Amino acid sequence: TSTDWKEAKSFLKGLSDKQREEHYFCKDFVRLKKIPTWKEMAKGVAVKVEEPRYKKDKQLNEKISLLRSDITKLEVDAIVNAANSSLLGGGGVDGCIHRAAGPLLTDECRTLQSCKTGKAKITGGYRLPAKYVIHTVGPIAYGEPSASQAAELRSCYLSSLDLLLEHRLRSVAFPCISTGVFGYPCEAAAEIVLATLREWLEQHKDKVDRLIICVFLEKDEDIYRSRLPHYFPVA
Numbered sequence: 137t138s139t140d141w142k143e144a145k146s147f148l149k150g151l152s153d154k155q156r157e158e159h160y161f162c163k164d165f166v167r168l169k170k171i172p173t174w175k176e177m178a179k180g181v182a183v184k185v186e187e188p189r190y191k192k193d194k195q196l197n198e199k200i201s202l203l204r205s206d207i208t209k210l211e212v213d214a215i216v217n218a219a220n221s222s223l224l225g226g227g228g229v230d231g232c233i234h235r236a237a238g239p240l241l242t243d244e245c246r247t248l249q250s251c252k253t254g255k256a257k258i259t260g261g262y263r264l265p266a267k268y269v270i271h272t273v274g275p276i277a278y279g280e281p282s283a284s285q286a287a288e289l290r291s292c293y294l295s296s297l298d299l300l301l302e303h304r305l306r307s308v309a310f311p312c313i314s315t316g317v318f319g320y321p322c323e324a325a326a327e328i329v330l331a332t333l334r335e336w337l338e339q340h341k342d343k344v345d346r347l348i349i350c351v352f353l354e355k356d357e358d359i360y361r362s363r364l365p366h367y368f369p370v371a
């Protein structure tokens with residue numbers, strides 16, 4: 137029981153990544169190689185002219201992706217879970233991740249007992265194509281977030297990336313933390329995420345191959361695609 141997850145986790149750890157594929161809950165996973173970068177995705181896109189706020193950086197544009205997808209399908213080192221402080225699961229992407237990873241994910245989460253807002257903890261990925269899950273707890277906005285809550289949201293992304301770094305992982309996908317059940321406005325969240333990932337990549341670009349913005353609703357897809365050229369200029 138309380139070593140079930142331990143055994144499975146350690147077991148999957150030894151498998152080659154195409155041995156792992158047989159164990160994935162899905163057969164339609166998305167390999168990282170097939171996820172295009174922002175440098176590629178920006179070819180042919182009309183950037184409406186603006187007062188510039190960032191320098192174009194080819195190399196940083198190679199390390200961020202925006203993708204509309206179910207995040208459980210991404211074959212990356214880690215997907216980030218928009219969790220609750222109890223790590224019990226829930227009806228948003230937390231529920232998709234728990235169902236796709238399996239009941240053994242729940243058992244590891246029980247040993248981690250809680251997660252504070254703006255903080256993060258890592259578990260194994262189990263049946264998920266992703267090797268690990270980084271669980272973080274966003275602020276609960278109730279429509280109109282406070283400045284301290286804008287800081288908590290930024291802090292979920294930084295604590296998540298800090299854990300990536302400590303565990304020497306190089307690919308991660310993020311869902312739109314706090315914007316579902318926790319009610320953060322989608323526009324204000326994306327401004328914070330994009331500013332945060334740019335500055336983080338300025339300082340740590342050598343340590344990762346890809347940060348992925350995994351959006352789920354068209355609304356966030358539209359929001360992010362329109363703000364990406366401001367934070368990651370291409371011309």
Ligand SMILES: Nc1ncnc2c1ncn2[C@@H]1O[C@H](COP(=O)(O)OP(=O)(O)OC[C@H]2O[C@H](O)[C@H](O)[C@@H]2O)[C@@H](O)[C@H]1O
Pocket residue numbers: 205206207208218219220224225226227228229230231232274311312313314315316317318319320350351352353356
């Ligand atoms: N399968 C999916 N793949 C990727 N993104 C998804 C998926 N399903 C939903 N999203 C997007 O994920 C984004 C985040 O929405 P939410 O998941 O509510 O998270 P929160 O931080 O606001 O609420 C956390 C609470 O609810 C939780 O269940 C926890 O247990 C907590 O109790 C939205 O844009 C979704 O469209």
